[PDB]
Design a binder for these strands. Sequence first.
RNA 1: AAAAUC
RNA 2: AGCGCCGUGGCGCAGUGGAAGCGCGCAGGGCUCAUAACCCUGAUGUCCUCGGAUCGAAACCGAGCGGCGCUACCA
Lengths: 102, 229, 267, 86, 129
Amino acid sequence: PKKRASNGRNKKGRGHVKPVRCVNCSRSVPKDKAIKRMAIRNIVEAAAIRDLSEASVYAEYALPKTYNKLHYCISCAIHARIVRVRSRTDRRIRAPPQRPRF
Amino acid sequence: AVGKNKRLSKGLKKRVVDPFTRKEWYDIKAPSTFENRNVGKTLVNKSVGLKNASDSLKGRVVEVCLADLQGSEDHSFRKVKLRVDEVQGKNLLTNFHGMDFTTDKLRSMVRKWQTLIEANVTVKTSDDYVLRIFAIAFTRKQANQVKRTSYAQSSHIRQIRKVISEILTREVQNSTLAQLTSKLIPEVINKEIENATKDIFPLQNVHIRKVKLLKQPKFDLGSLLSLHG
Amino acid sequence: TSHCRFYENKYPEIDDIVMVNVQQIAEMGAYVKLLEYDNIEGMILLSELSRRRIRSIQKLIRVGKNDVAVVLRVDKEKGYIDLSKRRVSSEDIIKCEEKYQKSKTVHSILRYCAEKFQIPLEELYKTIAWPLSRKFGHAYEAFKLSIIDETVWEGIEPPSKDVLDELKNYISKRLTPAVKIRADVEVSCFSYEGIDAIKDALKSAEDMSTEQMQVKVKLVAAPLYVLTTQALDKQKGIEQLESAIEKITEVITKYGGVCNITMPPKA
Amino acid sequence: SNYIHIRIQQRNGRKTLTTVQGVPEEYDLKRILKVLKKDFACNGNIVKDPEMGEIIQLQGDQRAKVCEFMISQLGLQKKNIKIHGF
Amino acid sequence: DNSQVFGVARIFASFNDTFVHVTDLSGRETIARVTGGMKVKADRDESSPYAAMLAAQDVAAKCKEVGITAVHIKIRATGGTRSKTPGPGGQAALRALARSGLRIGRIEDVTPVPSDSTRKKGGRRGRRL
RNA sequence: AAAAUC
RNA sequence: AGCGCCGUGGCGCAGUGGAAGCGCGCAGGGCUCAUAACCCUGAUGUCCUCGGAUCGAAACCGAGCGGCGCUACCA
Ligand SMILES: [Mg+2]
Ligand SMILES: [Mg+2]
Ligand SMILES: [Mg+2]
Ligand SMILES: [Mg+2]
Ligand SMILES: [Zn+2]
């Protein structure tokens, strides 16, 4: 039975797509069906900014952020809670989960 | 700790003694085109007859933040690599080697729903410095757009990059190292690129990255002293 | 009395590894006495107690037995020592038990001295043990070098000379290590006269025997002649046996036969 | 000398393991494990046991069958090999 | 400027190891090379934040005895193909550099990132834990 | 994680 | 016949110099519905016999015993 209309892959008109490797289990998966997450974080946590700020020669220096895109395999992500099973009627809600920070 | 087999391919006692007492410091000075000319202080093993300390010194590379040599914080993202070539004794003098962005600004400028433009050029300077210069641009959302994306057609990219090539070649082939750096520090090349490319496509975050040196001619001491003090 | 420690200081230094006798565990861990530093109670809590989770809280820790522990913190103010059992390497435990038995041996010797002389062990360690552990780094190595060189006792004032005599007697009785060096040689004779050759070769071999180094070349079979020697220094026996090899080969080059070696001088 | 005998070790759920102790070195062991595996459809191990010797552990509970292989491969005696009931 | 002696921290943190290693502005010669895994014995906690913190304290003491006063931060991951994320311990190493007297400036990340350049360990189907 | 029987 | 190794509490290793060790077993218990796995609890010794320095020895030695290993059947 057709689980999804878009086949849960999102190509529809390219025949084939270059595959990219998972960051957790190193699985090769097509880039479209690769459930990607941009992890923008600081080099230090919120519990360390104080010590670095008081141990800094520059008074107004703002610590820079680390950027990287994460390409998961699907199984690791279902395991690592970043992607969640849904009820059948709620599968089709394409919009990203509504921001809790309202 | 000590998760070791000690399979060494043997003396009863090894005299590590003091490694730092046989070491001396040396102050680094930047080319005059940078404002805060004093750089820092590097350590090195003391002189011996067979091997000159200055020999080991000439050839060193030092990374500095441009804001440290400017004083302003409008240049915290840039990264200047200088080259140790001549030493005056307890003080060493350096020549320009290269430029870069800290990775943070680089990944910051690369956002989604906008196509970046990467251009490269290889070019000889006025005197002999064979350089390679990169150029990054980002297509800008108009101040009126409802179009979520701001993608540019490949023809626009190609004309833009041809213009970039012309501008960079014109700027480099004319001027020397000192003039080139004095141009880069206010990044007026950025303004010139923006002005030229405003006719073809609206452009944003244009910068000049990774000023990479390929070849340098035979060293001239008088020129180095000219760049200093 | 038997109270003084083996080492120099009273309270432990940081990140040092010793071996502890377990006495009791209540709820936070085992606060047990030390047997390498000065006698004092240190705490080994549960998450610092077993490399394995905590499934057998009775097996790996034994009330009344000694196991290796490591110093994590030392509060050199009132009374407190922090110790851990997990933070000891698999190879390190061997050196820890080596040092513990070292300490126990020296402690037992000095305890015999104190029990026979009724002097508190603190004075025995102060007047003797710590100067030797300063000059050589250890008191056991110092006893070993006293066996071969009396000069280790120079520069230190004993509590009494009779104590020195009794302790030197005890270390000679206990810490004495005459290395048995055996070689074996094969007479492969085919010639006319070989028995008188063996007789006079072994007579010469026994002639070079010294009052301190005695050699008796024994027989276990016709070809296999065994040379057994005692070497008070391990270097004289090999020379004795090489000289013997020279003697037998010289004797056999003239009578006509041949003598071959299987095992040259080895301790 | 060099007596040969087979033992049975039971397990949970009636499953069983068979061990022949002592094997002549005239024929090598891997070449014999190969044909043990097919004719028996059971997993096998050339395990090392100190002071005991190399042992070809096999699955199942079979004694006349390992014996029937023995009669043909190298064994020509059928007198030294002993079968244990257990 | 009160003549701070500047260096770089060059913190390299894998998931199995943490490297706190200060060197001079040039970076050619190396002041301190004490490793995070050195400070622990279990060999499973080589990258544990405590090990990095303790190695970092060792580095700070070595710097203050050498004469180093200020340090630039060079956080690094394994890079290449293995991973792109900082090691779990390097963060505590940076914290320990922070709260240890030494002055800090110019924190940045220097993770070597490839342009999708080579095959990655694991095969097609990858790790199957 | 290793999970066995039924 | 000669020189090397060993001497359990059922079995092995460990300490050999404060005086009875651990695991393996065995027995029982607990975990459980229930078997393994796992977690607790024990009861067994002139650690082969006889002498000796030693406050002290099962431990250090030796004066003999039993069983193994090599030389090799030693007219
Ligand atoms: Mg289905
Ligand atoms: Mg089409
Ligand atoms: Mg899975
Ligand atoms: Mg493989
Ligand atoms: Zn994965």
